[PDB]
Amino acid sequence: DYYHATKTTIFNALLNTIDLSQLAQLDLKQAGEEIRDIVAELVAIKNVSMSVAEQEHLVQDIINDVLGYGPLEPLLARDDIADIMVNGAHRVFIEVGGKVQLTNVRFRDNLQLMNICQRIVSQVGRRVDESSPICDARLPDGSRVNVIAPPLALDGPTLTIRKFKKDKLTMKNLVEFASISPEGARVLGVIGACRCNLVISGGTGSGKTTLLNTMTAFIDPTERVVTCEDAAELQLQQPHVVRLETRPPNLEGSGAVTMRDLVKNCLRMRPERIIVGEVRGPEAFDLLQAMNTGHDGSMGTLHANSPREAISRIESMITMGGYGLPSKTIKEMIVGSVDVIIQAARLRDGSRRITHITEVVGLEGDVIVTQDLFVYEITGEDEHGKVVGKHRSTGIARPRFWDRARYYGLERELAEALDAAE
Amino acid sequence: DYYHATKTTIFNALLNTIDLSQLAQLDLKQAGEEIRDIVAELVAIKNVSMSVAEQEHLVQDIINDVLGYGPLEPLLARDDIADIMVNGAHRVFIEVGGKVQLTNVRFRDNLQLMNICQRIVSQVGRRVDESSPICDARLPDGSRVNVIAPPLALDGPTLTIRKFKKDKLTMKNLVEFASISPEGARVLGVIGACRCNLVISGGTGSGKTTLLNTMTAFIDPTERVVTCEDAAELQLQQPHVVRLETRPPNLEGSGAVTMRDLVKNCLRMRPERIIVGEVRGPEAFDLLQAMNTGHDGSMGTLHANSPREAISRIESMITMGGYGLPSKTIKEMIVGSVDVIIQAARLRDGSRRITHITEVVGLEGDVIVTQDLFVYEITGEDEHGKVVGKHRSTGIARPRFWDRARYYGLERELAEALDAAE
Ligand SMILES: Nc1ncnc2c1ncn2[C@@H]1O[C@H](COP(=O)(O)OP(=O)(O)OP(=O)(O)O)[C@@H](O)[C@H]1O
Ligand SMILES: Nc1ncnc2c1ncn2[C@@H]1O[C@H](COP(=O)(O)OP(=O)(O)O)[C@@H](O)[C@H]1O
């Protein structure tokens, strides 16, 4: 239609109206006003016949293309849409009500899609191109953006925006979802309250962050909890929480304060309990020190499918930090610091369940010896395709952290809960 | 209400009339006098009337806000306040008697809090800002300051001021609280006077630093004492003490002076006693050398929950130094260097107790063997919930360090205190 030709002509004319870095750094309102003025002047020059609403829509589209996120803007604004999927400039899918459906939306060119994706990832200081075709990030809004570049994605740039959900689950919801039996809920409450050094492992999308947010509710209000996280996602209810946020390197690459520096500083900030948002670098090492030297009860999320895998990953993480420790020293440090590893995994049917509560008991040569206080035993599938399982206690009577439970008077609750279900 | 509104109006008028550039480097007394005159003129013009004391207090508060530290200045002045913790401009906490308590000291806005933090850090010739958000400094007063800027501190800049307490506890206080029986006090006096290579290990918040500072009171004044400590907590009263502190590397990663380097240099100062504030890394190794190769009489704290746990920790930290020393060599070094390990722990009721005063009598069967001279035996909680315990002397008539006590002519005090405790 004539609208497309008019938009193309307006874009071509405006291309020389300002530098690429001029509007990107200027005020958004000023840039929008300038774009509106330029669009009106171009329309008047071309004598394009359109209504005032049509002119406003054209101006909005021009602004979105110049500095926005292009034809994604209608989809991003919508609330019913949970996921946006762009498999090339000509394929856009959206998830509504749990159903994925195709949309008439289509980007102008694969180059436009690549430009928009680069804009989105740079929004958080990350860059995607032929030298880094894969880029996964979490936007400030909380949505997660995953981008694959042309050289990997044959059909064009592949973009996945999982929009943020502001709702937060609670231990009541987890027990009602059967993610943890009531006895498991009480034992986890004891673990959180007794200042045990948690490590909330889990798999991609398995619910580690939500589990950690629900577990932190067991922290005594008087304690000073300090939160280090790559993106604001935890919501503690404690009156005395301190929220820190790792600053990614700028476009030039300066000003990079990694989470390791944040933890190293928290060591000198008088925190009662350090809560690392997600251990994804060498900070693990420092965190373990904070776990082992004061700051009892520090938690931390980790990406690993099994507690043994989590321990192996932590050891490899400490090794990768460049510190010249031997493997046995790292294993000894892990044994000393970590108290209990909670494993959250997503079952084959898509449901999420806490599979293991594995207390690290000690070391034997090159193998860390641990005992599973709680284990999820699967038994089959329901007629609707859902998995069926039960949380069973391994019958341990005096877990290593029992002393801590005794120290805080939570001995009775643990004693009754851990043996109520077996 | 009325006072707050009047102060706000007066401050606005002064800011509109006072040029901040002149007060940036002008004399404090002259600037204060000018501010007081301007405030009086504004009050006369603004129909502000109050008591002479109220007007003087308002003028002083305005002057402090303009140039001083602001609303937290009275807290800094107060001795009773041990630690100040301001996370966000609207939440302030103080440590009183070891208890964290919120206060109604609310800053006007996060901008004022950032300005006050910048003023605080300026004293040490350092700057904290968006470019350099993390700052750690030791003010001339001895109070440590840690500041985090907005881009990292999500809920506003954070400021932790750990003031240097002067009223350090003495052995008289410790015996007053029954933390150590008077016989235990005499044994500790003998241990500290006779230059024993002792390690004061303890649990979180147990009182290791206070115990070490009480132990240091027993050293002959003529002895040259060199203290290496990150936080500068110890306060000795001898006339020939040398105080050193480490340096954390700048965010660029250069300038670090680890405790290891400090101790390695202290080896070349002919010190009579090396007193490491807290052993936390490979520096332990060097200390052990300084403990056995001259400088006999060293001391050093360490975070561990039991004498055997402390020894294992020392082995681990020596191992993590990158040296090729096997387990046997390290254990032999520890046995030959250390004499007395003092374990202080906090009990269920929050009361500190010197749980153990043990020796390291030797190495047998490839494991280090200890010998408890003083132990704490608990007899269950009382009807009030307080733990009931007694200090029991094992009755060992000939401790390994006995000869040392004899060399200084204190053997009679040792034999009396150790036996009378039975
Ligand atoms: N037990 C649960 N029951 C139902 N929904 C859950 C459960 N745990 C998590 N969820 C939901 O699953 C989605 C992903 O969970 P969450 O955000 O906690 O992921 P995560 O484990 O932190 O992921 P990542 O590995 O990417 O950091 C969110 O909608 C969360 O609300
Ligand atoms: N034996 C004791 N009795 C009573 N209070 C103590 C004792 N030892 C330490 N404290 C208190 O504990 C507080 C902190 O102790 P601290 O020196 O930090 O021990 P550590 O350095 O081992 O954590 C001090 O303010 C002090 O008042």
Ligand SMILES: [Mg+2]
């Ligand atoms: Mg997460």
Ligand SMILES: [Mg+2]
């Ligand atoms: Mg200390």
